[PDB]
Design a binder for these strands. Sequence first.
DNA 1: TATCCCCCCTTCGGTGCTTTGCACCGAAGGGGGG
Lengths: 416, 553
Amino acid sequence: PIETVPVKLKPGMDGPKVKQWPLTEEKIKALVEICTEMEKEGKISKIGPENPYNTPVFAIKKKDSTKWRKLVDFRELNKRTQDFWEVQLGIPHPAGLKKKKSVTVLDVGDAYFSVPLDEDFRKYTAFTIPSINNETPGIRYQYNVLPQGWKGSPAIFQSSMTKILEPFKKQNPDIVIYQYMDDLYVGSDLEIGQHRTKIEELRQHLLRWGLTTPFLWMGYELHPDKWTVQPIVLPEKDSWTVNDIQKLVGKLNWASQIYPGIKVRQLSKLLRGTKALTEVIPLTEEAELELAENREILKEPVHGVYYDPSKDLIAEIQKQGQGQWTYQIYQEPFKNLKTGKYARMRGAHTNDVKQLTEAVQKITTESIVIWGKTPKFKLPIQKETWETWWTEYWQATWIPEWEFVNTPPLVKLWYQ
Amino acid sequence: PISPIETVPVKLKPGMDGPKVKQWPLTEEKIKALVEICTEMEKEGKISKIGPENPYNTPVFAIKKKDSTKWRKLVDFRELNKRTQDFWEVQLGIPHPAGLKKKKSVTVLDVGDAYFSVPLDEDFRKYTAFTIPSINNETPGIRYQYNVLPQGWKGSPAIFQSSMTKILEPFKKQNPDIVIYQYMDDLYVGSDLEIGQHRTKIEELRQHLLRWGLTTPDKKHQKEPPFLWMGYELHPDKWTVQPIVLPEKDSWTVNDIQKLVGKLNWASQIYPGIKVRQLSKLLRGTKALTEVIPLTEEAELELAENREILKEPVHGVYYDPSKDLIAEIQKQGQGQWTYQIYQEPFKNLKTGKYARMRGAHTNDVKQLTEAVQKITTESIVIWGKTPKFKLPIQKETWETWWTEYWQATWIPEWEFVNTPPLVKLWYQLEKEPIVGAETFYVDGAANRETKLGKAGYVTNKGRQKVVPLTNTTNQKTELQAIYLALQDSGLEVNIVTNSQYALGIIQAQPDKSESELVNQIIEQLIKKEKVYLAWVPAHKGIGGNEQVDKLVS
DNA sequence: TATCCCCCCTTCGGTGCTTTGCACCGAAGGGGGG
Ligand SMILES: O=C(Nc1cn[nH]c1)[C@@H]1C[C@H]1c1cccnc1
């Protein structure tokens, strides 16, 4: 029995008090069945009304699975959980995981159930199961073990996880392993067959350890080697109209905050006359010179962009139509870290909320692999429809912190 | 003999102490009445006397809202509520009868003084102490406490809900055929049993509630239909709002208008077609709360429409789990819509109105997306399922809007129903400049220190007009320039603004806005045939941008 | 000169750039029903 580790909080800042969003009937049924079974096994014990604490709860059916898995939002608890960032239980980030042929994820979340939680801090994991039509009051409950989603659960489980990881890591130094929340990120430079065989071995090792001391057969693949930051490229053309010339000047201005090397003076001189937009302006020698030099600069990769460990990550998203999205992770509004683009998927060709959900999941997974801090999203969606429909297509097990934006960027600068 | 109910601990604030305040003297009659009631409750057992061992107390006042002069007693628990363990009331949503299921036999139980049956905390009775002056304050006061849950206290409803749930959970486990919804005082019980078997079950439940000492008077216990339940008269096959009457005033003041608005909104749950927008329009600009606001023609027309709808009573129906929820929306105009959540033709299950103005520049499609969102969330809360909308919008318009708008939107499921006034895009802009149109270069400039500025346009052919105006902000100078450029040319026109703010409105495609300027621009843009706008970096020597900038400098 | 919950309006106060006017959220207080 792992002895309990006392956990403190921020001085003079109370715990989580968040309202419960309404849920559908099937999700409520699955949630109540899971909670009753977990009480039968002693993981959760019913709690009284004296608790001034609550966190939401959602039921999500994960990929290639048919039974729902209870997900409890823990963002407020994570943000207010102090000292856990500076406690040495935090994981150093392997800088070699960005460059690997394949990465596989595992559902090692259930392994956290076997460690008892600190009793003094225990009052903060309260959660309510709502009722349909307000027939009955909230069926309140409380974990008795390590929760799934708290930033301190993997931190406390570091010792027992390392006691299992070191034999495998010692045997095979090639494989690099990282852990964020309930997820094990494991990758290698081997081919598909060798990677799958080694991952089988690893899962067998974990299962045998569990035997000796929502589906456990799930597996998701990732390929970090197919990610490239995409510089913006100017349109290729030889016959130019006034409208196209001026909109390219606009794009050069749009790129003037990214780089200091773009020169616009000559092409501004080309537009001294007040001609009609449809009028055709053949390009001149100086105009071609500036255009070619600027295109070379844009091809030249960005410089001056660097990571700062003490700052947050921001992941803007712009909708570009026809199921095309973009994203720009950064820490300071000019020095973009990693841009990108998410093409359309299959099955979501008529669902913008679904497409944004998949984009969120793919951005977060990427950023976790690259750096290990999830980015603070800036979603281009309506808050109420998001809160109403994000659950039905979400299939991850961790939730980032997002803020919404309502002012239109009105930019095709990133859309090529 | 009796079955006790275990307490639930409470505490004050750490570092902060309890309530030490006193009230002011009341009327001698009210004081005597309260004293009698308190002595009666003492000899009943709820209230015990307080000696010198509890020095500080809490003030108590007298109210007469119940009946006329009932001398109903309530205590000023303000300081206590300011200083005790904050609670989390988990049951806050009020039930709606639409979701009730058609039980063949129904009975409503009402618990009398059940807030007083549950006990209190021993430690906190010292802080739950109150004192009443003697008759006409001959003696300074008689000091009391509560060995039961006080009426009007932070945690009273929470603790009562928890206690009643604890009591009724065994009974619910006993029988999976009987449904027992409860909100605070009421205890609706319903089942598909026979007329005698259900009565026997209710009798046994009542005895089971007398086991812990709860009392339910037979007079309040309903016997035959109809059953009046928390404001909704529940007939066997039709819920209905308890009938209400609106004031027939001829000098309508602000609070009378507000009461009219409130009762109309409350009755909107079942009566289809109630409108309150122009009626509420009177409330804008609060100056004096005593005078009488004249009823304008629009207000009186809306009021007459509400009255003529309210003349006849209409009844809803209970939900039936074996059928599929279908909703509908009609566009009343000016920003008002209607709900017809039903399951069978011409059998409503609910009705409502959406009238919130979200955004200073929005249009019909966005407001129909906020309408269906509200229907969806309320349907989730009340039923657990999302209904099948019957939208007025047309598939082509919805596709052309959602594939091209910059945010992300989604409407669950619907089929287009042909019923005017339809929602459609009034004007669709252009993305590429056309061949056979002019070109307007517009620009607005003004100074904050001058409160005046000049705006104008310089087309390709040399036409120029600089119209000076004052008191109009810069974003407004630009908007004016776009207005001039629209007014000057013909059905087709290419307009090249240099302002970043301006283009957002026009591209958003509004049909209505707070600003008259924007409303004029909308009128012009509907009138024109093919309009293309364009942005240009300001102050970069780009064609006529600086040419007109120098003039408006 | 009592408490607490849903909902419906309007007023003013904070945000963010949308740059300082403008759009856009958040409670305060107004009524309806418990
Ligand atoms: O629960 C109720 N139902 C009811 C319907 N009509 N009249 C009464 C009582 C109104 C609520 C109450 C009021 C003040 C303090 N605590 C509780």
